A paper describes a structure:
Influenza viruses contain a single-stranded, negative-sense RNA genome complexed with RdRp, which comprises PA, PB1, and PB2 subunits.
The manganese ion lies in the center of an octahedral coordination sphere including four protein atoms (Nε2 His-41, Oε2 Asp-108, Oε2 Glu 119, O Ile-120) and the C-5′ hydroxy and C-4′ keto groups of 36. Additionally, the C-7 hydroxy group (luteolin numbering) of 36 formed a hydrogen bond with Arg-134; in the PA-Nter–luteolin complex; this interaction occurs with Oε2 Glu-26. The C-5 hydroxy group of 36 also formed an interaction with Nζ Lys-34.
Numbering used by the authors: -4 to 53, 73 to 196
């Protein structure tokens, strides 16, 4: 589901490190990036947001968990849980917030945000894990309506997501993409 024009877009739009991390994530499930090109973009976007979110508070307020191999990912997680004694999650989250001492799952959606907020809450079966959704239309939604970052930072993120929708639109990739969301 998608085009080599979408493939080309991904390679032009996203930082090479992000591109390679997504190619690796997909291949680990037997998916081919130059075929399932809508997932390629989807995975790339979720990564970029995660990295943007981490560089949004103070220095080293967040530990990044997404983008890491499973062993290092669980190394970080297991260590944080030892140093802080917070309930160890059953699935790998995306960040840890040292300041509010909780994990964060981050969602990015091309549908309505309330819908994606539940599927996460149900899959993550989040005990103490904080959830935070974003859309490409400027919608956001967080646990107990706690948005963690300041607005200048949250807006830096929403504006980037908007930016991507548009560039996709000009290239006529957006509906396929909006359509293909499982
Ligand atoms: O929140 C997260 N989401 C994802 C994730 C993984 C996928 O494999 C996806 C896919 O194949 C299609 C799709 O439309 C969206 C996808 C999102 N990975 C890590 C997270 O923290
Ligand atoms: Cl990384
Ligand atoms: Mg993740
Ligand atoms: Mn996530």
């Amino acid at each position: 589901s998608g085009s080599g024009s979408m493939e080309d877009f991904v390679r032009q739009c996203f930082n090479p490190m992000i591109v390679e991390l997504a190619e690796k994530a997909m291949k680990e499930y037997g998916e081919d990036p130059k075929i399932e090109t809508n997932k390629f973009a989807a995975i790339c976007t979720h990564l970029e947001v995660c990295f943007m979110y981490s560089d949004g508070g103070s220095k080293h307020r967040f530990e990044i968990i997404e983008g890491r191999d499973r062993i290092m990912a669980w190394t970080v997680v297991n260590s944080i849980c030892n140093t802080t004694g917070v309930e160890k999650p059953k699935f790998l989250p995306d960040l840890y917030d040292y300041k509010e001492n909780r994990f964060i799952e981050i969602g990015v959606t091309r549908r309505e945000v309330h819908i994606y907020y539940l599927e996460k809450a149900n899959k993550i079966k989040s005990e103490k894990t904080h959830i935070h959704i974003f859309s490409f239309t400027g919608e956001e939604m967080a646990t107990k309506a706690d948005y963690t970052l300041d607005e200048e930072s949250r807006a830096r993120i929403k504006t980037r997501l908007f930016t991507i929708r548009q560039e996709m639109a000009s290239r006529s990739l957006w509906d396929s993409f909006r359509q293909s969301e499982r």
